[PDB]
Amino acid sequence: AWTTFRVGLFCGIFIVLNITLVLAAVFKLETDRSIWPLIRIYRGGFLLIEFLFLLGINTYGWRQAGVNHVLIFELNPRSNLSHQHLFEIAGFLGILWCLSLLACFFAPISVIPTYVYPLALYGFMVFFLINPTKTFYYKSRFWLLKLLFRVFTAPFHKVGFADFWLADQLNSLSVILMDLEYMICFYSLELKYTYGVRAIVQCIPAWLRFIQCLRRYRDTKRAFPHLVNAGKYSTTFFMVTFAALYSTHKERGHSDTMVFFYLWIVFYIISSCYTLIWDLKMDWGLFDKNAGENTFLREEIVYPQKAYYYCAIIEDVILRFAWTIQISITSTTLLPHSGDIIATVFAPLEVFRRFVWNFFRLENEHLNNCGEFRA
Amino acid sequence: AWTTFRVGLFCGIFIVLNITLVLAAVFKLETDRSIWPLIRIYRGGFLLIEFLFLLGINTYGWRQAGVNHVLIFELNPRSNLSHQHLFEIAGFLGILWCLSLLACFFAPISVIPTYVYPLALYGFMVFFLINPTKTFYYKSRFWLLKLLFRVFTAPFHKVGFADFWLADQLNSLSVILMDLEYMICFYSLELKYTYGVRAIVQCIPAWLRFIQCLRRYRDTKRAFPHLVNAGKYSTTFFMVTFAALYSTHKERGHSDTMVFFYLWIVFYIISSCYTLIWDLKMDWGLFDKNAGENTFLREEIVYPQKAYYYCAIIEDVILRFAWTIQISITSTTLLPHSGDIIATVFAPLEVFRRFVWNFFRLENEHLNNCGEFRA
């Protein structure tokens, strides 16, 4: 009962603080200050809070539908985080994020500069994730720490479902790593263009998934689907490389900009179509020839409404193109005027797309064992 | 689960709004405006919210200790409001009170004057209590409506426990009726001294209890304890009358002020001692000769800590004198400079005293049937 009460309390405090932030931004903020570094700095924390909240909704939906995510994730049948616990953590972190932003906007006691409050927020987030004390969700935290270590050294633990899945979530959360790189650049040079390092950081999650697919292929020696998956995860390498080359040959003045633009366009189309088709046919497994009366769906559907699947198909079709364009914009000077806002609009939309994708990927795993992670 | 979530949500919103009200009063309010009519107008609603919250705590304590309040109140063994429901209602009403005060302080859209927001708050409170729709706690609301009708026509329904008990709660809530009379006086004359009508309003709850005791005596024909209880409830009549007479003969300039002051003092002492002794010996039933090792307590104590009873004795001894002085101040010009704040400090303290009294009166009723309301 105390968990539900804490969830309600954090939700109410968060709602009031968000209303306060809107009012303060409209009035106190007025129209001044290159506030954009602040937006980039707080966007990643906001996206993590949104991801945690949507993951709570995902867990509730899995449990209600009967998807056995505890077995698929290889977790203990019992003593496992519920959706209320994820809501609680998300509410607490949202409260801390709101307070940090409110201080950054209201200019609190002058002894501590305003450039510490985002630092304090992220430092507390890291310490809460990493503290060795056995106090706050310590089992879940240690499991997540081991999974993150396994994922970032991807070539060498052999890939289970959770590894695979966290790497894909990262592929939907690459904006946080770019925000960290931007934070490192801004706090160092400008103090509290288009370069290869930023493109590498942008490609890092795709690199993790790609090398995981390569490891799975050397474990199983099956060209399909692991090498096809690797090609899918290399399409973004090609797209980012060509976008960066086009921005370099457009900031320098070279006449070879058009060719780099055309390869970027064709590879953007290829990446979008590749990921969309993999989402529709492999991850969710739809448009199956065995669909009797569930047109364009598969024979077995667990979720009650058939309209959910059609709406999900439409939203995924739109949002995959949105995601490819946002990856192109963030890592590349391609759109130097509107890109900024586009990225801020699109990143929560991509988190929402990953949230929708989680339902149907987990359902496909439950039914047809689409990942081949079970014997 | 939704009830607990709503309780947490309302509590969080209320806490944030109270912090906002404190900040606004310190800054926006500054030091201007005869804000005192506002304090008198909102004090009654604040006291009702505090009473509901403390009643929720009372119900939780009764249930945990094993006191059978459902039987004592003659309510249905099942389908009965829990403490979470009282917390929910108190949180919602506190939110509405906070919003009304925040509007009164922030001067919202000018088409609606600020003298409507307290009016809107109390009108919604009345309509929520009285609406015939079967929507929000309608069983509890209709039961309360019947009980209030029974109580205010006290000479003629014959007194059960709930009647008796609600009238005593009113005796602890007389400040709300004075606030209503002050609101009627202020909105009419001064527009949106010491007179007999205010004293009558102050004596109304004591009148209800007194005539209930008279009715119980004509039903049972037992001089003890009903006539003694009537004398206890008439002590406040004498005290208020002498305080009003002393204020009249001190605002006019008469030389007979000293005698009216001395009778007021002796009757204040008599009323305080009378009510304190009735609280300690009859309501809670302590200092019993059958106390074996629970010194100055009674033989059977249900609540686990013996220190609770001693702390309650001390707090009741102090707060009965505080309550008599606050009744004297509110209905009488006795203290024209400090009285105002004293009353505002003391009324929540008297509500707290009634909250403490509820535990031990209900426990005495459960054990020894001290009210003789059971056959």
From Swiss-Prot, chains A, B:
Result of changing G8F: Monomeric; decreases phosphate efflux
Any one of the GO CC terms? plasma membrane
Report the domain of life of the source organism: Eukaryota
Sequence ranges on the Extracellular membrane side? 30-34, 108-113, 254-256, 336-337
Effect caused by changing S247C:
Decreases phosphate efflux. Decreases phosphate efflux
Q: Tissue expression, per UniProt? A: Widely expressed. Detected in spleen, lymph node, thymus, leukocytes, bone marrow, heart, kidney, pancreas and skeletal muscle.
Outcome following mutation: R354A: Decreases phosphate efflux
The entry's stated outcome for E350A is:
Decreases phosphate efflux
The biological process GO terms on file are: cellular response to phosphate starvation; intracellular phosphate ion homeostasis; phosphate ion transmembrane transport; phosphate ion transport; response to virus
* Reported impact of F164A: Increases phosphate efflux
TM helices/strands, residue ranges: 1-29, 35-66, 80-107, 114-135, 159-192, 193-221, 223-253, 257-284, 304-335, 338-375
For the site Gating residue for phosphate transport, which positions are given? W323
Activity control, as annotated, is: Allosterically activated by inositol hexakisphosphate (Ins6P).
Q: Which UniProt keywords apply?
A: Cell membrane, Disease variant, Membrane, Phosphoprotein, Transmembrane, Transmembrane helix
| Topological domain ranges for the Cytoplasmic compartment | 67-79, 154-158, 222, 285-303
Query: Outcome of mutating R361A, per the record?
Result: Increases phosphate efflux
Residue positions binding phosphate: D168, N171, K232, Y233, R320, R353, R354
Provide the protein's localization: Cell membrane
Q: How does it sit in the membrane?
A: Multi-pass membrane protein
List the Gene Ontology MF annotations in alphabetical order: efflux transmembrane transporter activity; inositol hexakisphosphate binding; phosphate transmembrane transporter activity; virus receptor activity
For the EXS domain, which residue ranges apply?
A: 193-375
Q: Which family does the similarity line name?
A: Belongs to the SYG1 (TC 2.A.94) family.
Function, please?
A: Inorganic ion transporter that mediates phosphate ion export across plasma membrane. Plays a major role in phosphate homeostasis, preventing intracellular phosphate accumulation and possible calcium phosphate precipitation, ultimately preserving calcium signaling. Binds inositol hexakisphosphate (Ins6P) and similar inositol polyphosphates, such as 5-diphospho-inositol pentakisphosphate (5-InsP7), which are important intracellular signaling molecules involved in regulation of phosphate flux.
Q: What disease association does UniProt give?
A: Basal ganglia calcification, idiopathic, 6: A form of basal ganglia calcification, an autosomal dominant condition characterized by symmetric calcification in the basal ganglia and other brain regions. Affected individuals can either be asymptomatic or show a wide spectrum of neuropsychiatric symptoms, including parkinsonism, dystonia, tremor, ataxia, dementia, psychosis, seizures, and chronic headache. Serum levels of calcium, phosphate, alkaline phosphatase and parathyroid hormone are normal.
Query: Subunit composition?
Result: Homodimer.
| Protein's recorded name | Solute carrier family 53 member 1
Shown residues in whole-protein numbering? 231 to 625 of 696
